[PDB]
Amino acid sequence: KSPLQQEPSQPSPPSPPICMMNALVRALTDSTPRDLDYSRYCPTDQAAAGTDAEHVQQFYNLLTASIDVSRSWAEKIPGFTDLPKEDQTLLIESAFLELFVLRLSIRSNTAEDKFVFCNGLVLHRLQCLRGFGEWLDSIKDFSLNLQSLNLDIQALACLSALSMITERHGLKEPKRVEELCNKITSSLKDHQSKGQALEPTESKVLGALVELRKICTLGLQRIFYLKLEDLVSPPSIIDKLFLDTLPF
């Protein structure tokens, strides 16, 4: 009598408003040290006296703390949990080095040649030169460029989420990760329109994004040689990350 065909053409009322930008910023502000720790901070530190083995030990200890902080950072993000369990794990492991570098560069001061970690620990430049070496130096150069961009708090919050969220390879539903990426870009996009220019600085971000990626692969390269040496052998979590992640 009355058959149905074609699309329903339902307007579909808009979803209720969400403070997406605020949530990202809130998480970003809490994951920063206040007390600060300069007990081991020194103006001069030459690579010597167990430089390799001791520094390598320091390297994993810092990352172990960094990844837990990164996890909490991801956990604070709204809609992060909604993604499959495996997706959330894949995103964290792949983006752990990127988040550490990105967050470290923002917090660090290139003019002062000092690096401030999310734990408040400061390793100047030479202190991390023992292992990172030229790898650290690249981060300092990257940080200077990043500072030039400025990137407000809200803009920065979306970008850190953007770095964390991206299509990998054996992803759970590429679209789950992409869905979240679009969500971050939605908040971010309105942020870029807030300024008088109304021009998105994403293109500038992508140029620094490639450089950021170079650091991510550089981190893998440095540790690859150190692991062959096996000065102290990486922890299960960090070694797991290396094997789980791929250079491609």
Curated annotation (Swiss-Prot):
Q: Explain the induction of this protein.
A: Induced by inflammatory stimuli in endothelial cells through an NF-kappa-B-dependent transactivation of the NR4A3 Promoter.
Pinpoint the NR LBD domain residues. 16-245
The Low complexity compositionally biased stretches are: 1-9
Quick one: where's region Interaction with KAT2B?
A: 1-248
Subcellular location as annotated: Nucleus
What is the reported tissue distribution?
A: Isoform alpha is highly expressed in skeletal muscle. Isoform beta is highly expressed in skeletal muscle and low expressed in fetal brain and placenta.
Q: How is it modified after translation?
A: Phosphorylated by PRKDC.
Protein role:
Transcriptional activator that binds to regulatory elements in promoter regions in a cell- and response element (target)-specific manner. Induces gene expression by binding as monomers to the NR4A1 response element (NBRE) 5'-AAAAGGTCA-3' site and as homodimers to the Nur response element (NurRE) site in the promoter of their regulated target genes. Plays a role in the regulation of proliferation, survival and differentiation of many different cell types and also in metabolism and inflammation.
What UniProt notes about the protein's domains is: The AF-1 domain mediates transcription activation. The N-terminal region (1-292) directly interacts with the C-terminal LBD (380-627): the interaction is potentiated by AF-1-mediated recruitment of NCOA2.
What disease does the Swiss-Prot or TrEMBL record associate with this chain?
Answer: Ewing sarcoma: A highly malignant, metastatic, primitive small round cell tumor of bone and soft tissue that affects children and adolescents. It belongs to the Ewing sarcoma family of tumors, a group of morphologically heterogeneous neoplasms that share the same cytogenetic features. They are considered neural tumors derived from cells of the neural crest. Ewing sarcoma represents the less differentiated form of the tumors.
Q: How does it assemble?
A: Interacts with SIX3 (via homeobox); differentially regulates the transcriptional activities of NR4A3. Interacts with the constituents of DNA-PK heterotrimer PRKDC, XRCC6 and XRCC5; phosphorylates and prevents NR4A3 ubiquitinylation and degradation. Interacts with NCOA2; potentiates the activity of the NR4A3. Interacts with NCOA1, NCOA3, MED1 and KAT2B. Interacts with EP300 and NCOA2; mediates the recruitment of MED1 in the coactivator complex.
Q: Which family does it belong to?
A: Belongs to the nuclear hormone receptor family. NR4 subfamily.
List the protein's name. Answer: Nuclear receptor subfamily 4 group A member 3
Originating organism: Homo sapiens
